């Protein structure tokens, strides 16, 4: 559970960065 | 666009459910 | 040039006994 | 340290007469004569390369060289020694030692133990030959760095350097004494 939660949190952070990059593009 | 929104939606949903699983394991 | 010195003296500084 | 402390063409002429007499004394000197001739020739051309002022100068120079080769008093041994020492001291070799030193300091930062040990040891020998070289600030910082270096070998090499240097020059040693006597407890 801990490993998978950490995975999901970091993925949410990455996709947040993705939407930032999207807004730039 | 549609990719980043649907990925973020799935991720947040899974993140919520996984958090609940964590809460289930902890105590 | 300060290239590779050991961090402080803790490598070789066996403290003085009394 | 034990040596130092158009006329050039006339000196070349004088040396040629010295060797010319020695040809009579002993064979094989002709080879030396031709060798010196070729070396003067190439050195004038190489300085030529670096113009018309020196073009005219070098064409009289080189023509005189050709003539004088075709041409094959009272000057003797010690004179010849001092002249050739001077003319060598003009060549781009006596002012090379400085450069060499710089090269050595590139070595001190490296990723192999033995090479750095031996470099430090040879430097210790160097300084113990010429004790007035602990003046350049870069070598100072080098020996400090190596005094703090992270390997026992170069550490003992460095302390041996500093100790022999202190021993050689009797006075002026109280400036390295503190950094020296700190190092006794070095595991």
């Amino acid at each position: 559970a801990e490993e998978d939660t950490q995975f999901n949190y970091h993925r949410k952070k990455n996709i947040a960065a993705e939407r930032k990059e999207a807004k730039q593009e | 666009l549609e990719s980043v929104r649907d990925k973020f939606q799935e991720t947040s949903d899974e993140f919520e459910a996984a958090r609940k699983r964590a809460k289930k394991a902890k105590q | 040039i300060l290239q590779e010195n050991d961090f402080g003296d803790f490598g070789m500084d066996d403290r003085e006994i009394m | 340290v034990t040596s130092k402390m158009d006329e050039i063409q006339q000196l070349q002429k004088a040396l040629l007469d010295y060797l010319d007499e020695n040809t009579e004394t002993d064979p094989s000197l002709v080879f030396s004569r031709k060798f010196y001739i070729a070396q003067w020739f190439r050195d004038t051309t190489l300085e030529t390369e670096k113009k018309e002022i020196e073009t005219t100068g070098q064409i009289m120079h080189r023509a005189e060289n050709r003539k004088k080769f075709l041409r094959s008093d009272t000057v003797d041994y010690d004179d010849a020694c001092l002249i050739v020492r001077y003319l060598a001291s003009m060549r781009p070799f006596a002012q090379s030692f400085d450069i060499y030193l710089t090269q050595i300091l590139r070595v001190l930062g490296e990723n192999a133990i033995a090479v750095r040990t031996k470099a430090m040891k040879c430097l210790s020998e160097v300084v113990a030959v010429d004790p007035s070289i602990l003046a350049r600030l870069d070598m100072q910082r080098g020996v400090h760095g190596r005094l703090m270096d992270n390997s026992t070998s170069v550490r003992e090499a460095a302390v041996e350097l500093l100790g022999r240097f202190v021993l050689c020059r009797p006075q002026l040693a109280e400036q390295y004494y503190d950094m020296l006597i700190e190092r006794i407890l070095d595991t």
Partner: protein
């Protein structure tokens, strides 16, 4: 001279018998903190260097202390400051330590912090205290990351 004699005596105690110091380590720092709060860098560094030989012991004491104090325990803020300063001061001679510590802090940070922020937005001096705790630990992570200047990608790559 005091702690010089002390630490030398301790290394003599340790060199014969391997386990002993590793047995009582967290109570050590706790008593040290009580002593300091009775009296008034890298003070704890000597013990840390000594206990670096065993890989499992190294992982052990660190994981126990760090996780127990921060996540659910109402440890003294001064104690948190003391342990944090000691952790930052610690000399590191390998690469396992920053990656391990960063990994676990991140995980706990993630879960705890997320819960905290959602409960505060959904809804409190108790919040102030526990939030102070979590933020200091955050800042430790950030200062560490600045001390190495490594990309979060490389860290998360480590497992």
């Amino acid at each position: 001279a005091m702690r010089n004699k002390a630490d030398q005596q301790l290394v003599e105690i340790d060199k014969k018998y391997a386990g002993f110091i590793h047995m009582k380590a967290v109570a050590g720092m706790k008593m040290s903190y009580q002593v300091q709060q009775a009296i008034n860098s890298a003070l704890c560094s000597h013990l840390y260097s000594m206990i670096r030989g065993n890989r499992q012991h190294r992982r052990a004491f660190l994981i126990s202390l760090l996780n127990l104090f921060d996540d659910t325990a109402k440890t003294d803020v001064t104690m948190l400051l003391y342990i944090a300063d000691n952790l930052a001061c610690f000399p590191y001679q390998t690469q396992e330590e920053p990656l391990f510590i960063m990994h676990h802090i991140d995980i706990t940070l993630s879960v705890s912090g997320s819960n905290l922020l959602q409960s505060f937005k959904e809804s409190l001096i108790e919040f102030a205290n526990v939030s102070q705790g979590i933020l200091l630990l955050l800042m430790l992570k950030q200062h560490l990351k600045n001390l190495c200047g490594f990309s979060d990608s490389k860290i998360q790559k480590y497992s």
